[PDB]
Design an enzyme around this catalytic site. Structure first.
Site, PDB file in Angstrom:
ATOM      1  N   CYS A  56     -22.741 -20.704  15.683  1.00  0.00           N
ATOM      2  CA  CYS A  56     -21.499 -20.774  14.918  1.00  0.00           C
ATOM      3  C   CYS A  56     -21.636 -20.180  13.530  1.00  0.00           C
ATOM      4  O   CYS A  56     -21.196 -19.051  13.304  1.00  0.00           O
ATOM      5  CB  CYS A  56     -21.037 -22.229  14.815  1.00  0.00           C
ATOM      6  SG  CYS A  56     -22.394 -23.361  14.434  1.00  0.00           S
ATOM      7  N   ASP A 106     -29.458 -19.930  25.232  1.00  0.00           N
ATOM      8  CA  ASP A 106     -29.831 -21.152  25.931  1.00  0.00           C
ATOM      9  C   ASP A 106     -30.272 -22.251  24.969  1.00  0.00           C
ATOM     10  O   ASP A 106     -29.805 -23.388  25.053  1.00  0.00           O
ATOM     11  CB  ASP A 106     -30.952 -20.858  26.929  1.00  0.00           C
ATOM     12  CG  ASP A 106     -31.279 -22.048  27.812  1.00  0.00           C
ATOM     13  OD1 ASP A 106     -30.347 -22.585  28.447  1.00  0.00           O
ATOM     14  OD2 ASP A 106     -32.466 -22.446  27.863  1.00  0.00           O
ATOM     15  N   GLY A 107     -31.168 -21.901  24.049  1.00  0.00           N
ATOM     16  CA  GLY A 107     -31.785 -22.877  23.167  1.00  0.00           C
ATOM     17  C   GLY A 107     -32.638 -23.846  23.963  1.00  0.00           C
ATOM     18  O   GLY A 107     -33.419 -23.439  24.826  1.00  0.00           O
ATOM     19  N   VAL A 153     -29.279 -11.295  23.733  1.00  0.00           N
ATOM     20  CA  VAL A 153     -28.185 -10.993  24.624  1.00  0.00           C
ATOM     21  C   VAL A 153     -27.915  -9.494  24.556  1.00  0.00           C
ATOM     22  O   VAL A 153     -27.321  -8.929  25.471  1.00  0.00           O
ATOM     23  CB  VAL A 153     -26.928 -11.782  24.273  1.00  0.00           C
ATOM     24  CG1 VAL A 153     -27.001 -13.156  24.899  1.00  0.00           C
ATOM     25  CG2 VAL A 153     -26.774 -11.874  22.766  1.00  0.00           C
ATOM     26  N   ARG A 154     -28.378  -8.845  23.487  1.00  0.00           N
ATOM     27  CA  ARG A 154     -28.187  -7.401  23.331  1.00  0.00           C
ATOM     28  C   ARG A 154     -29.166  -6.598  24.204  1.00  0.00           C
ATOM     29  O   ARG A 154     -28.854  -5.489  24.654  1.00  0.00           O
ATOM     30  CB  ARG A 154     -28.337  -6.986  21.864  1.00  0.00           C
ATOM     31  CG  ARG A 154     -27.473  -7.757  20.869  1.00  0.00           C
ATOM     32  CD  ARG A 154     -28.212  -8.981  20.377  1.00  0.00           C
ATOM     33  NE  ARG A 154     -27.986  -9.260  18.965  1.00  0.00           N
ATOM     34  CZ  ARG A 154     -28.741  -8.788  17.978  1.00  0.00           C
ATOM     35  NH1 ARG A 154     -29.772  -8.000  18.250  1.00  0.00           N
ATOM     36  NH2 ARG A 154     -28.464  -9.109  16.720  1.00  0.00           N
TER      37      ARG A 154
END
Ligand code: SAH
Ligand code: ZN
Ligand code: ZN
Ligand code: ZN
Lengths: 426, 197
Positions: free
Chosen positions: A237, A168-169, A214-215
């Site tokens: 990135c 999200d950041g 996310v893990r």
């Protein structure tokens, strides 16, 4: 030095420019170059077709248009064009000092956009659009996002959206959502960088449900968190983009994270029998190696659109966008309340040294002195509300660090625009 | 899954990725002969494999994927095998509304990193069963298996020390032959669903 000597003997009129390849200097002319008068070989045709999309840098296409090479390049100021021409090609083909003749032009239009079609020994073909049209028939049909559609829904009843945000950041998604004026039932987001987290916990009064990596998220975590209507994410990135020497590829380092998205998307997307409208969006850099992008498109089975903030924001940088959103490849709609020029962003008593930014050394002049871009300004440049990112004690470099890797708010508005029709509104 | 009566057991249709177990599956009487025309679709580099390719290759029952042998060249980073395997395996599963016996197995020969093993066990949703080759009381070789095939956790051992495992990885470097005998026996409880010969 075959090219230098061959062009030199082209200028001495000992050889015709139409029997050589104006790109690499080969004599194996297989086709006529679409843009300029002269021949082109098969290697340069493939070079053009592959590197036209391989070489797109953030904000520009980075080219060179001619040899598909180049280090130092001249950059076009036309915002509908964005071509570039290296200095070596201009000094070689046009003539000595012609590059220094081209520069000193602050709003510099390239040889394609220019009034004249003839510059030195360089001559533009009058029929170049359709020549590019046929030239580009062996490629780019494997790309450019062939979207497929969902059936519309009646007002009564239409439920509030349920959204899952991976990486999200800064809460760009929930912001663009609230701004779009649609009800949000559940906004569960996965973010690490504690600063980003605090920004979210403040600028939305705790509406966001935060999860770890996310893990950390399990396939069961997904369905247990209720069904999700929209899954968005921009994976970091770094090791993806080619401007990094240490890039470990999509498969190592920070690249891996893509697959985590790929995973949680799969554990999200409804199975057969579900006619439920379901939307997803995965953003990344355009500086990606062609191999890694190929893989990503394969894993998502979809192709990306290259959206540039240029058209509606004050900065020009372009990103790839994978998904199924309505009006995916739709032309960018510039608002009235959107700030197109850099000058519209700066604080009082500062002026713009350029039109749109990059980060083009120091964009702002203040009191006859060069200056770095301000935060409260940079926010505008990215379309975030003013002082949106002013929260906690977070250091200036950290703040800028955050905005530097965020989404362009008006762009995400353009993406989330035709979404208001599938869900609840206020 | 439910067992399949003898007078109904079909030929088993297999998809062998990166490695080829045509040999072992024939020696187990799952594969008959003649081409095979065809029951085992083997492919070594599926970087260019679309969902349609898999669907068109006839329906599948068994999907097998392996890493390269211990210290065998480089090719692509270890994780590639895992991820690709996962993608194609989603391409191979049957529709929710048309259930049927369906099994898959990914197996590593000590080629995956600690983080890579974490990724494997997270993306395949089980911890690996580690099947050692011992001799004279010594860890000669080892594979680790992720699979839904009914008897799998039935081996796995214990005593192989994760540390000693990762040490055995170090001891054997340059030579490299894939240790298939370890994985061969896992397929046995699949003879409850497919014909023998
Ligand atoms: N392993 C991980 N799990 C979850 N989030 C991660 C992560 N590694 C990095 N991130 C986060 O992912 C973000 C990628 S940059 C993209 C952020 C987003 N597009 C925005 O609007 O701001 C970074 O903010 C970083 O903090
Ligand atoms: Zn050429
Ligand atoms: Zn050039
Ligand atoms: Zn131009």
């Amino acid at each position: 030095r075959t090219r230098e000597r061959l062009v030199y003997e082209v200028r001495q009129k000992c050889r015709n420019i139409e029997d050589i390849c104006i790109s690499c200097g080969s004599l194996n002319v297989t086709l006529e170059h679409p843009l300029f008068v002269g021949g082109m070989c098969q290697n340069c045709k493939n070079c053009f077709l592959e590197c036209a999309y391989q070489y797109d840098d953030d904000g520009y296409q980075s080219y060179c248009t001619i040899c598909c090479g180049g280090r130092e390049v001249l950059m076009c100021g036309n915002n509908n064009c964005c071509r570039c021409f290296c200095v070596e090609c201009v000094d070689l083909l046009v003539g000595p000092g012609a590059a220094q003749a081209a520069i000193k032009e602050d709003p510099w239009n390239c040889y394609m956009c220019g009034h004249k079609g003839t510059y030195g020994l360089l001559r533009r073909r009058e029929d170049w659009p359709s020549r590019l049209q046929m030239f580009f028939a062996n490629n780019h049909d494997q790309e450019f996002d062939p979207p497929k559609v969902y059936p519309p829904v009646p007002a009564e009843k239409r439920k509030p959206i349920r959204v899952l945000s991976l990486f999200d950041g800064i809460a760009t998604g929930l912001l663009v959502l609230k701004d779009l004026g649609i009800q949000v039932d559940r906004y569960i987001a996965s973010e690490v960088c504690e600063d980003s987290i605090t920004v979210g916990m403040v600028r939305h009064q705790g509406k966001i449900m935060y999860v770890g990596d996310v893990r950390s998220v399990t396939q069961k975590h997904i369905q247990e968190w209720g069904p999700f209507d929209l899954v968005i994410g921009g994976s970091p990135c770094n090791d993806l983009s080619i401007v990094n020497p240490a890039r470990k590829g999509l498969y190592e380092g920070t690249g891996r994270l893509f697959f985590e998205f790929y995973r949680l998307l799969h554990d999200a997307r409804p199975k057969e029998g579900d006619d439920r409208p379901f939307f997803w969006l995965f953003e990344n850099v355009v500086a990606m190696g062609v191999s890694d992008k190929r893989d990503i498109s394969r894993f998502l089975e979809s192709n990306p659109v290259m959206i540039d903030a240029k058209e509606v924001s004050a900065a020009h940088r372009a990103r790839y966008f994978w998904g199924n959103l309505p009006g995916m490849n739709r032309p960018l709609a510039s608002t009235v309340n959107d700030k197109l020029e850099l000058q519209e962003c700066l604080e009082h008593g500062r002026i713009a040294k350029f039109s749109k930014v990059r980060t083009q050394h120091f964009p702002v002049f203040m009191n006859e002195k060069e200056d770095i871009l301000w935060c409260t300004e940079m926010e505008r440049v990215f379309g975030f509300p003013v002082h949106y990112t002013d929260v906690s004690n977070m250091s200036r470099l950290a703040r800028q660090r955050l905005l530097g890797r965020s989404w362009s708010v008006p762009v995400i508005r353009h993406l989330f625009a035709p979404l208001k029709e599938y869900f609840a509104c206020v | 899954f439910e067992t399949v009566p003898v007078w109904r057991r079909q030929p088993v249709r297999v998809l062998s990725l990166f490695e080829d177990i045509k040999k072992e599956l024939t020696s187990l009487g799952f594969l008959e002969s003649g081409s095979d025309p065809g029951q085992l679709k083997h492919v070594v580099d599926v970087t260019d494999t679309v969902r349609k390719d898999v669907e068109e290759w006839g329906p599948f029952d068994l999907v097998y994927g392996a890493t390269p042998p211990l210290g065998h060249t480089c090719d692509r980073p270890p994780s590639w095998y895992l991820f690709q395997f996962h993608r194609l395996l989603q391409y191979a599963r049957p529709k929710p509304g048309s259930p049927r016996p369906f099994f898959w197995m990914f197996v590593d020969n000590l080629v995956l990193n600690k983080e890579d093993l974490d990724v494997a066990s997270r993306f395949l949703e089980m911890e690996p069963v580690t099947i050692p080759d011992v001799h004279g009381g010594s860890l000669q070789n080892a594979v680790r298996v992720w699979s839904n095939i009914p008897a799998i956790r039935s081996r796995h051992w214990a005593l192989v020390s994760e540390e000693e495992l990762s040490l055995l990885a170090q001891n054997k470097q340059s030579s490299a032959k894939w240790p298939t005998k370890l994985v061969k026996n896992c397929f046995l409880p699949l003879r409850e669903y497919f014909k023998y010969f």
